[PDB]
């Protein structure tokens, strides 16, 4: 479980208003800690976790300046992209970026990334070597040539290997009481009506952190992902998460099935079954 | 800290 710092940028054009909106969020692991929204009056980078509030005005000023610049660059970019794709001004289009760093066990960059999408499809991405780009279509090759000409990749690599990692370590210290403590799931099995073919068993995992978890159903030593409904992991609202897995089983045969829960807050996987 | 590298598409 290597820690990570990641930023998620979304820019959307608004032809009815003749403008665009830019939204940025930052995460450490699965915990959001900052946001920026170009639609806010006098928009600033804003704290979204308690442990980041100890940063002084120099931090918030410098973060605000960078996000204001990025917001303007992405607005102008939406117009360039509309040109590249032969699109009219009637519709709304979406430009996204995500980037971040994972911290290796030696304190060095384990994996850095920076990628971009247009209308929800991969556009251009920094390669694993942090030195070159891969472009998805002919429009993206325009950007790629411009970014090669300007030696952008070298500047991204310096960020990902340097400031990104350094700030991650600092954040991890600042919020160590919450970011560095795993909360195990509280678990239980419920039973519900289904149809003629049997009863539903639902295995719950509640209030865990971080988000990564495995819920599996088994019958007599054999996986049941075949017929099981597995919901997307969802936020509790307090910074922890929830998930469940359900399976229709023959009436009277509930005890032949076990739910198995792997989470890094547990010393060993939990095994549970309907009482 | 967010990236200062912002380049026009």
């Amino acid at each position: 479980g290597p820690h990570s710092l990641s930023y998620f940028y979304t820019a959307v054009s608004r032809p009815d208003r003749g403008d665009s909106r830019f939204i940025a969020v930052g995460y450490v692991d699965d915990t959001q800690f900052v946001r920026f929204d170009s639609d806010a009056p006098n928009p600033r980078m804003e704290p979204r976790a308690p442990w980041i509030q100890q940063e002084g005005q120099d931090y918030w000023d410098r973060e605000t300046r960078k996000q204001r610049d990025t917001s303007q660059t992405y607005r102008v970019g939406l117009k360039n992209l509309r040109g590249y794709y032969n699109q009219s001004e009637a519709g709304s289009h979406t430009y996204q970026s995500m980037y971040g760093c994972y911290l290796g066990p030696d304190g060095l960059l384990l994996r850095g990334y920076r990628q971009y999408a247009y209308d929800g499809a991969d556009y251009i991405a920094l390669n694993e070597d942090l030195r070159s780009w891969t472009a998805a279509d002919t429009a993206a090759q325009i950007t790629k040539r411009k970014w090669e000409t300007a030696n952008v990749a070298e500047r991204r690599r310096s960020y990902l290997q340097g400031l990104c990692v350094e700030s991650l370590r600092e954040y991890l210290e600042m919020g160590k009481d919450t970011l560095q403590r795993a909360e195990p799931p509280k678990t239980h099995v419920t039973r519900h009506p289904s149809s003629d073919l049997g009863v539903t068993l639902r295995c719950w995992a509640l209030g865990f952190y971080p988000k990564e978890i495995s819920l599996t159903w088994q019958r007599e030593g054999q996986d049941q992902s075949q017929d099981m409904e597995l919901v997307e992991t969802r936020p509790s609202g307090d910074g922890t998460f929830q998930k469940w897995a359900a399976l229709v089983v023959p009436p009277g045969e509930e005890q032949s099935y076990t739910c198995h829960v792997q989470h890094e807050g547990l010393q060993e996987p939990l095994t549970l079954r309907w009482d | 800290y967010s990236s200062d590298v912002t380049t026009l598409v």
Binding site: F8, T10, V12, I23, V25, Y27, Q32, R35, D37, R48, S92, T94, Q96, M98, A117, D119, G120, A121, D122, T190, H192, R202, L206, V231, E232, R234, P235, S236, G237, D238, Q242, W244 | -
Partner: protein, 98 residues
Amino acid sequence: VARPPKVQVYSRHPAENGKPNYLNCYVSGFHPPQIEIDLLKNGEKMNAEQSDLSFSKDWSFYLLVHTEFTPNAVDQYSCRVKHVTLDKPKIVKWDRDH
């Protein structure tokens, strides 16, 4: 192709009638990001807080809408979602089994 929203309605804690709790509508997997999400009490819109727009590794967006509430035997709760991919509003009812 636009991607339609997956919608889950659920409480922060297992529901107990008369006990203060939190009601959540988690909407994920959708694209484009323009979307309307309302929590409803007996069909009337609640003034619930909405999270900051973020997205997953596959570029699809997610949002949490949430508010305090105290369940009981009478009041019905649901989540209503409007998106370009939906020709009718998507309504998901809250039951304490999901």
